[PDB]
Amino acid sequence: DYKAFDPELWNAIDAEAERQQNNIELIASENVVSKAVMAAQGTLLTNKTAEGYPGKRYYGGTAVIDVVETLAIERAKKLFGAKFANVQPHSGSQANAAVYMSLIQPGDTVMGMDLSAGGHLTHGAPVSFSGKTYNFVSYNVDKESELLDYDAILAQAKEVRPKLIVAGASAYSRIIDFAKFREIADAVGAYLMVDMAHIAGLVASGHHPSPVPYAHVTTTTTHKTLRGPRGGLILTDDEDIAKKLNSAVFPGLQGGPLEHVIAAKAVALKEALDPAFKEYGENVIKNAAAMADVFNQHPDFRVISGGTNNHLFLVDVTKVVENGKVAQNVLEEVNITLNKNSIPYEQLSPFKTSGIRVGSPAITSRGMGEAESRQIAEWMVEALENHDKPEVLERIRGDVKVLTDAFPLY
Amino acid sequence: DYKAFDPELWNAIDAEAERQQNNIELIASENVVSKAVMAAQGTLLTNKTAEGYPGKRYYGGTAVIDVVETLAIERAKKLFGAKFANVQPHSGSQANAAVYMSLIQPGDTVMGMDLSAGGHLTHGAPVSFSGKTYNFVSYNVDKESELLDYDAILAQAKEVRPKLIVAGASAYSRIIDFAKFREIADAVGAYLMVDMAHIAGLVASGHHPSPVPYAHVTTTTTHKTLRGPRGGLILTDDEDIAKKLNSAVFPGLQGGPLEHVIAAKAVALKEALDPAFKEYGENVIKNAAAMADVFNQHPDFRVISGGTNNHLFLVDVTKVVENGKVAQNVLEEVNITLNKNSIPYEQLSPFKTSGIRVGSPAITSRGMGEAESRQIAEWMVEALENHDKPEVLERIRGDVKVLTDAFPLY
Numbered sequence: 001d002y003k004a005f006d007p008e009l010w011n012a013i014d015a016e017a018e019r020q021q022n023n024i025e026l027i028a029s030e031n032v033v034s035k036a037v038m039a040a041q042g043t044l045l046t047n048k049t050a051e052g053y054p055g056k057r058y059y060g061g062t063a064v065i066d067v068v069e070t071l072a073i074e075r076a077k078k079l080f081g082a083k084f085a086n087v088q089p090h091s092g093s094q095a096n097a098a099v100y101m102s103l104i105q106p107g108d109t110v111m112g113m114d115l116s117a118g119g120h121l122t123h124g125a126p127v128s129f130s131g132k133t134y135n136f137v138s139y140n141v142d143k144e145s146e147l148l149d150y151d152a153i154l155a156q157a158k159e160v161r162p163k164l165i166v167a168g169a170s171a172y173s174r175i176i177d178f179a180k181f182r183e184i185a186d187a188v189g190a191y192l193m194v195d196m197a198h199i200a201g202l203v204a205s206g207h208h209p210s211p212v213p214y215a216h217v218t219t220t221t222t223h224k225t226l227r228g229p230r231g232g233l234i235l236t237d238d239e240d241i242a243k244k245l246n247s248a249v250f251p252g253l254q255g256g257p258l259e260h261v262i263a264a265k266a267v268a269l270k271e272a273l274d275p276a277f278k279e280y281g282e283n284v285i286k287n288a289a290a291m292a293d294v295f296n297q298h299p300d301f302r303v304i305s306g307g308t309n310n311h312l313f314l315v316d317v318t319k320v321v322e323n324g325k326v327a328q329n330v331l332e333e334v335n336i337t338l339n340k341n342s343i344p345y346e347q348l349s350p351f352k353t354s355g356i357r358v359g360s361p362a363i364t365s366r367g368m369g370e371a372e373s374r375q376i377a378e379w380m381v382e383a384l385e386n387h388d389k390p391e392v393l394e395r396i397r398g399d400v401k402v403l404t405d406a407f408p409l410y
Numbered sequence: 411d412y413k414a415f416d417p418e419l420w421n422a423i424d425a426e427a428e429r430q431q432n433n434i435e436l437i438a439s440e441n442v443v444s445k446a447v448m449a450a451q452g453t454l455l456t457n458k459t460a461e462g463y464p465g466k467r468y469y470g471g472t473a474v475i476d477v478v479e480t481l482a483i484e485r486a487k488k489l490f491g492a493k494f495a496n497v498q499p500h501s502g503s504q505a506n507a508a509v510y511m512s513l514i515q516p517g518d519t520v521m522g523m524d525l526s527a528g529g530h531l532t533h534g535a536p537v538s539f540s541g542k543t544y545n546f547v548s549y550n551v552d553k554e555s556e557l558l559d560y561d562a563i564l565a566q567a568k569e570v571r572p573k574l575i576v577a578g579a580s581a582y583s584r585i586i587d588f589a590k591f592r593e594i595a596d597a598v599g600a601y602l603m604v605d606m607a608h609i610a611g612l613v614a615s616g617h618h619p620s621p622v623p624y625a626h627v628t629t630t631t632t633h634k635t636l637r638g639p640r641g642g643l644i645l646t647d648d649e650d651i652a653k654k655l656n657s658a659v660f661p662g663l664q665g666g667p668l669e670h671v672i673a674a675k676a677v678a679l680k681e682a683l684d685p686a687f688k689e690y691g692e693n694v695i696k697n698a699a700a701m702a703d704v705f706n707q708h709p710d711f712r713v714i715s716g717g718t719n720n721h722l723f724l725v726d727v728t729k730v731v732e733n734g735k736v737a738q739n740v741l742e743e744v745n746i747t748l749n750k751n752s753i754p755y756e757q758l759s760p761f762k763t764s765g766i767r768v769g770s771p772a773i774t775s776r777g778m779g780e781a782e783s784r785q786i787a788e789w790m791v792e793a794l795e796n797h798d799k800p801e802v803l804e805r806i807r808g809d810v811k812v813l814t815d816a817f818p819l820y
């Protein structure tokens with residue numbers, strides 16, 4: 001029993017398999033992967049170094065590695081309708097780094113969705129390599145609708161004359177019109193890159209329009225809505241861009257890939273090609289809307305853009321607690337995890353933020369429904385109304401456990 | 411079972427576990443991780459995203475993550491005798507990219523060991539971000555002795571005035587004098603970074619002097635001689651540097667870590683703090699020595715530098731086949747995997763090369779010893795001289811099998 005050898009490691013791996021139990025996970029990014037996926041990542045493909053690409057390895061003994069990677073690649077092309085997939089990127093951050101390195105030059109101009117409006121760090125935060133290597137200019141949503149204004153974005157693109165437009169977000173509730181993004185890119189001579197990391201399982205379930213026919217390159221995490229292992233993926237229909245991408249990922253940015261995690265990508269993409277995955281995304285879409293109803297109705301709150309068509313939404317809580325930092329602090333005490341989150345034209349300071357962010361793929365994968373979500377969101381509006389009242393927060397927490405117990409995990 | 415849904419994948423895996431029994435693995439980089447290490451990265455810490463560093467997460471629900479990572483950090487610090495450890499890098503390549511980003515500017519001059527003598531891609535190859543972002547200038551071994559010549563490296567450092575010297579290699583058989591490297595760095599006002607990826611388990615076993623007291627920063631894979639999961643690690647004793655390193659890895663280069671890979675780094679780091687790990691490294695040293703003996707004796711074959719004091723060595727072949735490509739092709743035909751390799755002052759093409767590279771760490775992990783190692787080297791001599799006598803190659807194959815059969819894997 002290897003567990004005997006290292007007791008205090010495998011008993012932190014237990015405080016966690018239980019912290020995941022008695023937690024209500026509403027962090028929009030999170031999910032719960034199959035046993036098939038977790039098992040694949042724990043194979044002895046972690047012993048084999050496979051630098052290069054299938055039938056183009058640096059070394060031999062890579063025949064069987066080539067079969068497994070080729071599956072991931074083909075299942076990705078199939079699921080997303082792309083002519084080329086690269087499955088080696090270690091993360092979404094590496095996937096995106098490889099695209100910048102393939103299409104543009106150090107110092108070129110890049111338009112990205114602002115980190116207020118829900119851009120990733122790697123869509124131009126000055127802390128990130130993205131922000132330091134290239135000249136990132138953000139676009140926002142409209143101040144009153146909180147929707148993408150494609151006319152606004154065009155005018156800005158015409159003045160800024162970016163080489164690359166990144167679309168995709170971590171905090172945007174509504175359907176992105178990728179045909180309009182490609183039309184804006186085309187109007188100014190820019191490449192379009194769509195980071196679909198948040199919506200990729202919705203793109204796979206048929207519930208969100210695919211960026212793949214409109215983006216020059218589409219990047220994604222294989223985790224989040226797509227509910228695969230942590231890692232990255234690049235898709236393109238353009239064979240020249242494919243060649244630059246492949247060269248950018250290896251040996252441009254990376255060495256040997258994590259063939260065990262690639263095995264786990266092949267698995268997650270078979271599960272996403274399953275009819276059952278449409279049900280899942282349908283259930284993801286409702287559970288998020290159900291949950292979102294509750295904040296709209298309540299007078300002191302406000303679901304952002306008045307609602308959601310994907311797996312998530314924001315909320316302005318600055319009428320009920322000092323800031324979203326506080327709102328978040330409060331809700332942990334009750335066994336509810338989600339995140340402080342800027343909101344369009346953020347009032348407060350970055351560390352504080354005017355409100356929270358919710359999503360539904362985690363609770364949805366734990367097999368929960370519309371009742372549960374409404375329930376959870378009442379518990380939230382409750383807890384934030386009564387942030388100063390620990391008898392209350394204690395009563396809510398007893399109840400959170402009622403439900404966590406009720407619904408399992410594996 | 412899960413294997414039900416996805417045969418094509420799980421029977422590709424089943425099959426790799428067979429190929430890694432029918433194989434003599436002599437690829438110097440490879441090892442055979444424990445069941446504890448696979449098992450641990452095939453757990454459900456993959457579900458949780460842990461942006462930031464212990465007690466400075468972005469999100470809550472961490473805390474039990476903060477304990478698994480704190481374990482890795484503290485095991486790495488105690489195993490290597492370093493004051494600071496960062497266990498977040500996804501790979502050796504991201505570990506190296508994070509040190510460049512912390513210590514030097516784009517365009518800054520860096521001296522690295524020549525790709526031909528053992529330079530890693532990330533030590534300045536023009537096809538790598540390393541080569542493209544910084545001014546890399548390589549040093550080589552002495553032409554006659556095939557040894558690092560520290561008077562020659564200082565003379566070049568005084569001409570080139572690098573901001574950073576990188577010591578460490580993928581194909582060097584001899585003890586590196588890390589104190590001479592830091593003496594040279596100090597003489598020209600340069601940082602010293604050591605990439606100990608290949609030797610990290612011999613540094614851990616006590617069989618290789620440590621870079622940690624002499625390198626401003628030390629990087630490594632957790633895989634290779636350290637026999638951990640695939641990933642990276644950064645060590646320093648300077649607190650100012652550790653702060654810069656930590657920003658550079660996140661949010662500089664990466665997003666959220668593979669906390670399940672990090673769990674499996676805590677596993678491996680405990681397997682290597684164990685008495686038994688010293689015995690492992692001793693057997694690695696003896697095993698490679700045994701194998702290098704055979705090539706010394708035989709007149710047509712020359713071991714580079716005349717021998718080895720670590721886990722690998724290079725053998726020349728261009729008096730007994732066209733090139734090393736042919737060498738490895740022939741050897742694969744017998745169930746012995748290793749790689750072609752440039753030898754110092756390579757004549758032939760990168761794709762062909764005058765040499766093979768041989769390592770003891772995998773076969774040592776399968777509980778093998780000196781007789782076995784000799785046989786393999788005998789076989790590799792037999793086959794390479796009888797390069798087109800397929801009666802021969804097949805007689806060997808059956809013997810290779812007798813032995814691969816004779817020794818287990820798991």
Ligand SMILES: Cc1ncc(COP(=O)(O)O)c(/C=N/[C-](CO)C(=O)O)c1O
Binds near residue numbers: 256500504641642
């Ligand atoms: C000294 C050093 N640093 C970093 C890495 C990078 O390892 P990753 O692929 O980024 O995790 C390597 C790899 N080397 C090749 C294949 O193992 C090889 O054995 O020649 C290395 O030798």
Ligand SMILES: *Cc1c(COP(=O)(O)O)cnc(C)c1O
Binds near residue numbers: 667
């Ligand atoms: C969550 C997210 C990522 C995560 O990146 P990692 O490097 O895998 O942590 C990347 N891009 C986008 C748009 C995301 O929403």
Ligand code: NA
Binds near residue numbers: 196222223224225226
């Ligand atoms: Na996803």
Ligand code: NA
Binds near residue numbers: 637
């Ligand atoms: Na190692």
